[PDB]
Amino acid sequence: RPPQLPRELIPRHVAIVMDGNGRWAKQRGLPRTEGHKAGESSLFDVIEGALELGVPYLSAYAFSTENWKRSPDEVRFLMGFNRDVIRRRRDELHARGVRVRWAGRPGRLWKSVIKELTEAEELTKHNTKLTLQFCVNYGGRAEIADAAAALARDVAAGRLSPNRVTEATLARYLYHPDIPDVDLFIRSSGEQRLSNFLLWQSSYAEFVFLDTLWPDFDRRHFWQACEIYARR
Amino acid sequence: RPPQLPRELIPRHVAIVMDGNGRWAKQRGLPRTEGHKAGESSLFDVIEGALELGVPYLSAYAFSTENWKRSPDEVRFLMGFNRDVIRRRRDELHARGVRVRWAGRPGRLWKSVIKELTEAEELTKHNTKLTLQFCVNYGGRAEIADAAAALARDVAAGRLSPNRVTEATLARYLYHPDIPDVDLFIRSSGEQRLSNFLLWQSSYAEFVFLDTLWPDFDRRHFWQACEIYARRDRRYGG
């Protein structure tokens, strides 16, 4: 049962770093891969939690620009896995009124990962109950640099004056400019850091650090974080 | 006495948000302005703490462009006060080998505040023991927007191609590109937020939220935060 909070104190936009999948599997003598598999159900449970509480925006850090520093085998697994999650869940997401918005760069992602993400976006683009910003091959600095590059192209083409480049001008060139600022930034684990996640958007966000590893995270932990947010 | 940490575990760059000045003065039945006055000595004690431990970069959020909680009178006082602090302390900073770097916008900030900041920069520009990034009329978003604007001007003048803009390109247009990433981000009080401070630079920073009101903050609290940092597991996505 979701907590009874006044509408004013419910976060419009919650961002979740889904960390500790590896560490969780080690503590249980399971392979790292099984932590990520367990993490899938955490995400769909948190999506249900957001739908029930009426949080209109959820951003999930699925795959960082910095995850390319992990082993070849773990990258191969994380690519295949994020693809298979989106394929297996897209019907449910469409049915529950979730609009999937892929944030990140195509970069060195497999074509099959880009295809699934692009199709999930197209399928769900008319949904309005919850916007899921699914961040795959995403970095906050990369997003800002891509915003400055796109702004630079408009300046070169003479669509924009360089003397009117302001914070509102740059904000228009973010991956999803219609998605508002992060109100609440949840770090599942004890790690107290942004890790390059929605950097521009999190400037004024409340940070809530829980000790729950992501595979043990569910709608109750999400509801707790929203309760902490409301009492602030 | 500063704690005995290996060089590898000493933060290269510490950033501090100096909050709780008001609440501290209220607990002692003094006006909020007097807590800011008391906060001055906290900052110089933390600067001594950084010098002793050998932290080469310190950034202090002295004055945010956005002061939305603050009364007009407290904002008027904090402008005059950040000016008077820098004027009164610049010789001591010069003597201790602290290089002052002003981060922020000229904007609505009084000419007298800009003058004192600019003179402190000129006086201390050859120092190398500690770089103090004194952030006055500063915002993280404002700095990134000013970087994009300066990049835009180079593109309009044809000094730069628009088609090859990367993270490293944009980073060259930050206020002080020679100052490295924040390793450790200290929020003095219990308030858990960045408050729009060194946003680009803090991407992979360790956050330490202490409960100390800023006027009670001194080198020992700074040393404690550095000790907490030395125990942190930094991964940068690896």
Q: Which domains does chain B have, with CATH numbers?
A: 9-138+181-231 (3.40.1180.10)
B141 SS3 class: helix
**C-alpha pair distances (Å), A66 with each of A151, A205, B23, B203:** 25, 22, 40, 12
Under 8 Å between Cβ of A189 and A215 = no
Between chains, do A169 and B204 touch, taking CB under 8 Å as contact?
A: no
User: Using CA atoms, how far apart are residues A75 and A222, in angstroms rounded to an integer?
Assistant: 28
User: Using CA atoms, how far apart are residues A97 and A130, in angstroms rounded to an integer?
Assistant: 7
Between chains, do A165 and B152 touch, taking CB under 8 Å as contact?
A: yes
**Minimal CA–CA distance to B39: which of B21, B64, B24?**
B21
User: Using CA atoms, how far apart are residues A155 and A152, in angstroms rounded to an integer?
Assistant: 5
A122 touches B: beta carbon within 8 Å:
no
User: Using CA atoms, how far apart are residues B53 and B207, in angstroms rounded to an integer?
Assistant: 19
Return residues 170-229 of B near A (CB < 8 Å). Answer: 170, 192-196, 199-200, 202-209
| Resolution for the entry shown, Å | 2.3
Strands B57-64 and B13-17: parallel
User: Would you state the structure tokens that stand for residue A175, as one six-digit string?
Assistant: 């991956």
User: Using CA atoms, how far apart are residues A109 and B45, in angstroms rounded to an integer?
Assistant: 49
Between chains, do A67 and B155 touch, taking CB under 8 Å as contact?
A: no
The residue assigned the tokens 């956050």 is B207
Q: Which residues of B204-214 are buried (b: 16+ CB within 10 A; e: fewer)?
A: bbbbbbbebbb
**C-alpha pair distances (Å), B187 with each of B15, B206, B225:** 9, 11, 10
Looking at residue B193, the DSSP 8-state letter turns out to be S
DSSP line for B161-189: -GGG--HHHHHTTSS-TTS---SEEEESS
Among A64, A155, A165, the residue with its CB nearest the CB of B237 is: A64
- Technique used: X-ray
For A72, the closest chain B residue by CA position comes to B238
Under 8 Å between Cβ of A183 and A10 = no
Distance from CA of A199 to the nearest CA of B (A): 7
User: Using CA atoms, how far apart are residues A221 and A229, in angstroms rounded to an integer?
Assistant: 12
User: Would you state the structure tokens that stand for residue B70, as one six-digit string?
Assistant: 């603050």
**Minimal CA–CA distance to B140: which of B66, B200, B192, B65?**
B200
A131 SS3 class: strand
- Among residues B67, B73, B91, B211, the one annotated as catalytic is B67
Among B141, B208, B233, the residue with its CB nearest the CB of A167 is: B141
- A127 noted as active-site residue: no
User: Using CA atoms, how far apart are residues B164 and A39, in angstroms rounded to an integer?
Assistant: 37
Helix (H) or strand (E) holding A223: helix A219-230
